[PDB]
Amino acid sequence: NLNETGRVLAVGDGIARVFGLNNIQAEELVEFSSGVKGMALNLEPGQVGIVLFGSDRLVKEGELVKRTGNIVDVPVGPGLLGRVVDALGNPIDGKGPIDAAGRSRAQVKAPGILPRRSVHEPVQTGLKAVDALVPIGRGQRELIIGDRQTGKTAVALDTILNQKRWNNGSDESKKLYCVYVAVGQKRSTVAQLVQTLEQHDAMKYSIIVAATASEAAPLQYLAPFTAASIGEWFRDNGKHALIVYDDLSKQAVAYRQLSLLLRRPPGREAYPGDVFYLHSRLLERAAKLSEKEGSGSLTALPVIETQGGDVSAYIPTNVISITDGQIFLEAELFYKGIRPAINVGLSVSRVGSAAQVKALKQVAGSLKLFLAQYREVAAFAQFGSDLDASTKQTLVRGERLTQLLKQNQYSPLATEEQVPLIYAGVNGHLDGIELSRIGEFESSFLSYLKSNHNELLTEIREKGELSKELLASLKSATESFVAT
Amino acid sequence: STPITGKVTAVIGAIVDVHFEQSELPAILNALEIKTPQGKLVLEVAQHLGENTVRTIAMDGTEGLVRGEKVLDTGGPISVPVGRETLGRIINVIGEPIDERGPIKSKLRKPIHADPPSFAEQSTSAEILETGIKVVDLLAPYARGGKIGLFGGAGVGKTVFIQELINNIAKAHGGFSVFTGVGERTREGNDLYREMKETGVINLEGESKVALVFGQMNEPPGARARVALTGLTIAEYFRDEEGQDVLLFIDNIFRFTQAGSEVSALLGRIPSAVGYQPTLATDMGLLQERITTTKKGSVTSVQAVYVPADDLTDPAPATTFAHLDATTVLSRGISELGIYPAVDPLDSKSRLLDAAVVGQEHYDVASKVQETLQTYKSLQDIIAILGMDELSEQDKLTVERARKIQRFLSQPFAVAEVFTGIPGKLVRLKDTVASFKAVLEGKYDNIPEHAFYMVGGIEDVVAKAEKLAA
Amino acid sequence: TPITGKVTAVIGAIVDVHFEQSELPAILNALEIKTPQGKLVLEVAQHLGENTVRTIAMDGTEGLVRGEKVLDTGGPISVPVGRETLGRIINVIGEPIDERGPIKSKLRKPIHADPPSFAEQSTSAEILETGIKVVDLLAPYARGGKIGLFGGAGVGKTVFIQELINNIAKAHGGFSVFTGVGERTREGNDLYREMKETGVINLEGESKVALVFGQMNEPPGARARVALTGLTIAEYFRDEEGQDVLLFIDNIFRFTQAGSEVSALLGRIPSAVGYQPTLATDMGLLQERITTTKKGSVTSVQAVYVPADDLTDPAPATTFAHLDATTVLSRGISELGIYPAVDPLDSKSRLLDAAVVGQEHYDVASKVQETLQTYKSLQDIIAILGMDELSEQDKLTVERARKIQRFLSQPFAVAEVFTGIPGKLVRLKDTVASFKAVLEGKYDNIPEHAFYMVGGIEDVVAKAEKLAA
Amino acid sequence: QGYAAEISARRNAMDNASKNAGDMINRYSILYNRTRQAVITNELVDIITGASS
Ligand SMILES: Nc1ncnc2c1ncn2[C@@H]1O[C@H](COP(=O)(O)OP(=O)(O)NP(=O)(O)O)[C@@H](O)[C@H]1O
Ligand SMILES: Nc1ncnc2c1ncn2[C@@H]1O[C@H](COP(=O)(O)OP(=O)(O)NP(=O)(O)O)[C@@H](O)[C@H]1O
Ligand SMILES: Nc1ncnc2c1ncn2[C@@H]1O[C@H](COP(=O)(O)OP(=O)(O)NP(=O)(O)O)[C@@H](O)[C@H]1O
Ligand SMILES: [Mg+2]
Ligand SMILES: [Mg+2]
Ligand SMILES: [Mg+2]
Incomplete structure (x- = not known):
């Protein structure tokens, strides 16, 4: 029965071309008989282009492939607090099954024009320079940008650590739940970061979603999106969540790898035509809901890595144009003694004093x-x-x-x-x-x-x-x- | 109904290929519909591929589409309601109300694709639109029923500028307005809609004077590529059939070209320079040439124009200039000095800056202000290395007047009050001319620089000067 | 009975093989073709469909004829592991190349293996003293960490690696693995001889080091795999023998470059700058194995070639995040006679933390960096207008910065031939006190030249005395 | 006497300034022509990759 299953025609580089699967939905999750999971991205006349969520060493020509009838989703809910998971919500901390409240699709429409209200509540980072000069509000998106090793993670990390002040209280409306997304990082670096969160007693209100260097491109592509649905649970239920995308530069590189391997024709610097869309539908989901929708909020601190200080390059321009402001870090200021190394002239928060x-x-x-x-x-x-x-x-x-x-x-x-x-x-x-x-x-x-x-x-x-x-x-x- | 059917054959991202039966292919630009569990997905026909298959562009996300799914031809292009019933309503790209206020019960719907007015239909005119903004009124005045463009890099002040114009021009104006959000922040939309209600420009339980249309950056490329035409068609109906003055605000028009760019490769096209579509200029032509005054009615349009990486030579903005009667170019360098609005006083231009139009006196002040400013730009390299001491007698005086002029061109906007804490000021064109004339004649040479910063007309300058001394 | 196929296509390193019946060799399997020389090894990379597989050769493909018989081996390329490999030189495909006969090890392991999970990670902040002033003071290395030496052509990556070996390998206690990737065979020959003399390799005795070589004369298949080979040996020592391993790789840029030589032949659409689209994940599959786990510890030092002196190139640029410490060597600095040519402002380490090195060390490192940055920020003014146009603060700061910069140079034992001077190893504590004092303006009257190419502050004082004559 | 000494010192400072700057110009003209070249190549490469599919 070629409708609910198909056979592999060809397989390589994390891509599989599958004959059959006639009833499959675009972006539907599929199960390979050999073990590994995959996502249906190209529905073509003769075949289906599928990107795998793992190794491909075990897949072969002729192998059976099976529908799930589900668009790629993930578990969501307060159950995830204190846990480290992969792009698909699977626990990778070795602490057993995650209890989910429900499941949310990876790709979710952002809140339209109507269900929103002006940002008006502080996200207190506890950083003198940020909180005084570039105040971040609940529902805002504030880009952290700079060259390698300039203090970018340090700014999100200190923000998460500083929520200790409200997260120990019993007042739910003043609490900020943190979600940290590691894309393209090495496992030791994420291990080191969870250890710091534990030593500060900050893990109990954080959720780590990890898609590290070794994992397949499509996992790295997906991680920010599934993390957002995790964050979205808090937003939709009258609470506040803060999400850190560390970093979108690496996610874009991963999206660029999927697309080239699917043989979609490249655009500028070989990224897909719609690399700008990748981030823009990601970040518009960060928002501050209206009263009718329970006033929950989600706040995004996307991270972008420049090269040679060049903030004029392709991906940084894209993201700078999406967010509500940027924090700009520079090596020169770091070595001069200015830490965090924030360039004040260039650095803006657009909510400004409304949320201070x-x-x-x-x-x-x-x-x-x-x-x-x-x-x-x-x-x-x-x-x-x-x-x-x-x-x-x-x-x-x-x-x-x-x-x-x-x-x-x-x-x-x-x-x-x-x-x-x-x-x-x-x-x-x-x-x-x-x-x-x-x-x-x-x-x-x-x-x-x-x-x-x-x-x-x-x-x-x-x-x-x-x-x-x-x-x-x-x-x-x-x-x-x-x-x- | 006499309904025509096809089947989905391919889905790659925004691109959907659809196979129909013999000699009943829908025409390029037709809307097609798919029934989805939530509501309906719209596709717009783009190409005839051969072998009875057409290529289409989705107006919403394609996740969840299945090969073999029934596709319905609607017989014509995407339609939008037109006329007075769009007033005080928010509408998306496909003509559908997105304000939860019920159906738009309008007598007619009209295709979003239409031919531009013929060359015979053009109507030339040199009537000045007084904005109340000193830098615009003096050096590059806007034209009634003309085309105005606000060029600017990320964060320089396009959206605040456009909001100031809405705040000044729209109330003074007696016809209807149409605002189109293209590829911008949905929360900017939520703000504008909340504003319109408090100002009374939109009254939910009565008459309204503005139509809102949104297709922001959360939406896929196809939506973002078509929403400007949706907003436009509404403005055209007011120009032609209503027969009255219409204001059309667009933020941001770059997003039309960018969306077009995002699908171009998957449509099957070799890219052009800087990764843009090979049809960049003709697509912009088809759209811009509709946004125009004719012999039937007047359209005054203000279009914010994003400028990638601050590069004004970038194909998109570069192609946009020539479409425009008056260009306001915003500058990072000027904003970084604390001068708002960050208008570059040398790069901003207007067809209307002509002695035949503004008068000889106005034209002369303008020229001399610009000459003073350019001399200052010229001498900045002697200052940076050898300092102010080395300048000539007459050169020192020009630099001191220029510094005052730079600052005097700044103005507190009403809408920018949250950013400044300074009450907004609106300054009549005639006071602007008289004010700057006096300065160029040396009547206020003893007054220090800061007195000219962030104020109104010349009386304000005098008033600040006395307050700083005390 | 064995699975055989016929060669249907050869383009350079890429060979396509067809298989007659249902069973096709898995991706990553080694295949074999009998040559009159010996045997050619192939590695399955993809399934083309129609029962054809696409392979990457591990040697020259000269001579191959369409139709030739191909043998499935049943698994990945395997290498000898355990103590038997110590004191030996080994191939990409696990064969001895020192003419000392078979490596009779108990086990053979596949060169491809999953990196240790997130649960298996083990992190620690422990300084590894190197005796090199710039490293110890400004960007200290970590025991069980990853260390990259970035550098353009001829700036001193190899000599830096050699000095590290000479300083840390000699008395380390555990085992070392050296992997030569895409470098000079003559340097391999140099090293082998060097180890034999320093008694780290004993032909008759015991040896602390295992050698693995895939140099720049090898086809791109070999250069793309030989690092995995060296790595597998290193992983056995870490997990099974629970040991502190030292992994030296020179040069890992060449793994990536080899990868890009075959990407087009594999049918990929090139990415930026004509690299393979899989540049980043291919790098993680390798890099993430080179780590310390709860079972044992791996300290790795990787040379990273910078093509056309461009640090923004996709290869080096992606390598940064895989490293706990980075020392970036600079052509500008080496052309001034400063060796090691480390960039004191671009070299970084996770361990430059007061909690790890103490407040005093951190404070001194900070202030060195401030001083140097002040000098850097003034390059333009100096080059055009010169010292006379500086303010008085600036003139002092620059004069001090010019000394600190010279004081960061060091005679290396391995570079003795080029410097003309015996090599010096300076201790971390000595380095901290020396620089501390300079910052305190206690040696402002001393001529710059005295700080150049010496040990700690004593050497400075001694050299200043000699020149007064 | 101080004036005449100063003016001669400024003449010679401005002389070395001009000379040092004219050196930089050369080095930067060459960097400019490399980069101008590389921009044409890199831009062509994208155009070509996009035309291969
Ligand atoms: N306020 C501060 N004062 C002193 N040191 C700091 C400060 N913030 C960060 N650092 C240190 O500076 C270094 C870089 O910080 P980090 O947050 O890792 O930057 P990053 O931009 O994420 N680097 P990477 O992801 O490695 O490119 C680390 O050693 C930090 O511990
Ligand atoms: N008239 C003004 N007075 C003071 N500050 C201003 C003014 N206009 C803009 N700004 C500053 O600029 C920021 C952005 O203004 P905005 O109009 O959103 O810029 P924009 O060019 O539309 N940015 P984008 O839409 O992201 O390309 C504000 O948050 C203010 O900090
Ligand atoms: N520590 C040092 N002291 C003095 N001279 C050095 C030092 N290191 C390198 N050199 C000089 O630099 C040359 C090359 O050093 P080497 O270690 O081969 O650099 P490299 O970057 O590995 N070259 P390559 O691998 O070919 O790009 C030597 O011939 C020496 O003249
Ligand atoms: Mg970081
Ligand atoms: Mg804006
Ligand atoms: Mg070398």
């Missing part, structure tokens, strides 16, 4: 514009010319503000800790302190604030805003510390 704690906003008034004024002023002074009060003051302030934003890894700060630092910077309380001492000032100011002005901190954390009275209290609390 008010207290943080209040204190970081024009910090971005000012740091821009500082960049200009510093560029000029490099002419070795003498300077006036105005130029020397801002050159002083900006130099300290830059220093203020440097931050160790795995060390995310609370909002109530960030506010007073930015405040002391922006209004100029740091201006008469030696530059090498800004690091020690940070911890000592906080230790002082935790001992004496602890009531101040609580107001900031619980209200999230600064009344005229709080500002006055904070003004005096800083001035007091500036002289021992």
Whole structure:
């Protein structure tokens, strides 16, 4: 019966051409008699082009191939928390069966125009530079982009670690469940990353979806999509999930391999014609739902790897045009001491202050514009010319503000800790302190604030805003510390 | 019904091949339909392959399609409802309401493919559209019933610009508007729709003055390739049969060319330069030449035009310029300095900047503003290496006036208030001319730079100057 | 009774073979054709349909005639494993090439095998001291980790690998495997002799190292597989003997390049730059086997050739993420006389963490990098306008950076002939204190030349004294 | 005396600046012509791969 089964005509490179399967659906999952699974991508007049989810060493000509009558899906639900799975939802951590709430297709239409509401809730990364200058909101997509080894994973990792603050509480609406997608990475690197998540007690609210270097192209292609359906469960059920795609550069390379092996005619740099679509339907699924749909949200931090700083290249241009903003990392700034190595001039969050704690906003008034004024002023002074009060003051302030934003890894700060630092910077309380001492000032100011002005901190954390009275209290609390 | 049937024979991504019986093939550009468990899938016929098989482009995802499935010919091209019943409604590429508000009970439907107006049907006109934006009104004024393009790289300000124009031009205008979202962010759509309601441009329980059409970047290439024509057909009906002034906003038109590009290889075509389709220019022609004023009615169109990697020489935007009566070119370099709107004052152009149209006085200020600006661009290499000290007496004065002019060209938009915290300002064309004239004559040389930044007319400059000194 | 076929087609390294009845050899199986020389080995790559298979040859295909008889061996290419391989030179196909007779090992293992799962991974942050200043200070290697040496033609990949062998292999305790991939036969001959002299190979005794060679004179099939061969030997030591193995590969870029020589003949549409579409996953199937697991540990040092000095090339570019530490050698730096030509700002390691090396070491490494970056950011101004146009801070920072840069050079024992000076091995702790002091401006009065091509700070002081005469 | 000394020092600095810069120009012209060449080739290659199918 050629309708529900077929035979292999030819097989090689993770592709199989199958005669028969007359009733198969485009993108349907199939089972090979030899063991390995596969996906139907090319439905042609004489045959079916199938991309395998594993090795092909065991498939041969003549082999029987069997329908499943299912479009490629995956298990979803809270059951997945604390688990490490492959692209198809199979547990790869050796901790037994996943309990699923249901199954969701890998490819799911994004929320249309109607079922959405403006992004208005902070995703607190705990990174001074991000949270003050490029605030990320619940439902937003914010690209992390940079050359190799520039701190890109470090920015998502610290974000996940910092959700510890709400995920231990019992308030479901303030919780953020994290999903981390590793595409093209090596297993030891993912192993190392789950170990860090455990040591920080962050694994209990994270889901890792892994399609690593050794796995078949079609698994790497699929992983972001199935991870999104995992994230989508939280979104559809009135909760919030944050998904990290590490990285989309590698997924695009994997899509490029499938398509060339299916002999679909290549486009620019040999990628498929619709490489832009691959990412755009991926990322539009990240969204902030309306009240009628239960206000759940999904937030995406896609990662893209440039080459030689070239943010003008094919895939980076594509993704930059999809997301709501980018964080831009650079080797030069890293070695200069600026860590995270965020390029402020180029780095934007488009939700901006709509999705930022008010207290943080209040204190970081024009910090971005000012740091821009500082960049200009510093560029000029490099002419070795003498300077006036105005130029020397801002050159002083900006130099300290830059220093203020440097931050160790795995060390995310609370909002109530960030506010007073930015405040002391922006209004100029740091201006008469030696530059090498800004690091020690940070911890000592906080230790002082935790001992004496602890009531101040609580107001900031619980209200999230600064009344005229709080500002006055904070003004005096800083001035007091500036002289021992 | 007298219905015609075929069978799916191939599915590769967006491309679907369909076999029909003898001498009853549907014509190229016909819509075909497949019944799906959810609703229906639309295909648009693209090629006749021979041997009674046609190649089609899907208007939705093809996942779940089976070889041998029945395909229905609809007899003509994708249709969309036209007329007043589209007002205050959101419509997708295939003419179907996507606002959950019921059917669009309009008297007529019309094909999204139509021939452009003949050469005899053209109507030339030199009437100025006052925007209230200083840089546009002074240096590259827009034309009533003309074609305006907003060129810009990722994140430079196209969408905010287009929103400002909607906010100023649309209320002052008395006819109807049509907004088309092509290949952009669905959440931009959700924002615009929420805005229109609060402004009253869309009243759910009454009359409305704008038609929304969306085909955003979540949608497959075929949808994104056709949705501009859907929005257009609605604007054409208002131009021709309603007989009145129509505004047509499109964000973003690049997405039409890009979508076209994404399927071109699977359609069977050798690529052209920079991986674009070989039909890039004729496809753009067929579409753009419909977006036009005729002797029957007026269409004023504003089209945002994305510019890949910031490269203005890239085939897509490069081909777009010549279709356009006035081009506003946005610039990363200008935005990075904190000047919004980031309009490049040298690269932006308008057919209307002619003494015969704006007057001699207006034209002279414009020229001299541009000369001052270019001199400054020219001298920037003497500044960077040898510094301001080395300049001539008359050169120092030109640089100081230029720096003021650069800043004076910036303006707080009403729609940009969340980004700035500055209340929006709208400035009359005549104040813009008078203001810049005074500056070029040296009437405000003693006033420092920051006083010209992010304000309105000249009275605002004077007011900021006194506030900074105190 | 054995399964036979006939050759239907030969194009270069690719041979197509037809099989008469129902049973076809699995993908990855070795096939054989009897030549008057000896035997030619083929490896099944795909099933073409109509009972034909497509194979990749493991030697020259000169002489093959359509119609020739082909034997299925029943499984993949196999190699000798265990202790019997130590002190021996071996083929891509597992044969002895040192004219010392048969390698009589108990077991033979297939060269193709699944990488260790995610559950089998074992991670640790442990410094492997090399005695090389730039590495130890700025980008330390990890015991049981992966280490790539990236470099264009003739910048010093091999000499760097040789120095590592000389420093770490001599007293290591476990076993080493050396794999020559697509490199110079003469370097293989050099190495063999070198090991015999340093007593790491003993013809009469015991040996710590097993040699596997597929050099640049070999057809692309051999160059594409020989690394798997070296790897399988290494995996046996890791899993079965639970040992700390050292795996040296020179040069792994050549595995990929061999892969691309045959991609078109296999009927693929070329990817970017004419590489095989399978560049990334082919690389993972290999790279992911070279790892430490819970059973045992593998420290690997891979030379990575950079074609046309282009680090963005798909081969090197994809290799980066497979490596725990990367030292990138630079032609710019080597043309200035600085060896090893390491790029102190582009070389990286996962272990440069205060939690691993201590705050002091991290702080010093950071500040070295700051100093050098400040100098780098000023190249243009310097080249046009020169030192006179710098500010006073900058002039100091640059003067210090020029020393740190020279201080990062080191005489290597293996490079003695080119430097003219005896080689120096400097200890990690010495390196940290030396650089610490320079950063503190304690040697600002010392001429640059004294920092060039010496050991630690003492050598500097001693050289400064000699020149004062 | 300081003026005359300065102007002679600026003349000779500007002399070496011009000379060093004119050296860079040469090196960058050559890099330019390599890259211009490589862009034509790489662009042709895509066009050709797309025309093989
Ligand atoms: N704020 C920080 N301060 C100091 N070091 C940091 C910081 N963030 C990251 N690093 C280190 O910098 C290196 C690169 O960080 P990582 O997040 O791996 O970047 P990446 O861009 O993902 N690199 P890769 O995927 O390897 O190309 C690692 O050694 C980090 O531990
Ligand atoms: N008038 C303005 N005033 C201040 N900031 C602005 C203005 N216009 C744009 N921006 C900044 O630019 C960002 C993007 O504006 P937007 O109009 O979306 O750019 P765009 O060119 O349409 N980007 P894209 O659609 O992604 O190509 C905003 O989030 C602001 O930060
Ligand atoms: N540590 C060193 N000290 C001094 N000279 C060196 C050093 N390393 C390499 N060289 C010089 O560089 C030449 C080549 O070094 P080698 O290790 O062969 O580099 P390579 O990058 O492996 N060459 P190839 O493999 O052909 O690209 C030698 O002839 C030496 O002159
Ligand atoms: Mg990373
Ligand atoms: Mg936009
Ligand atoms: Mg070498």
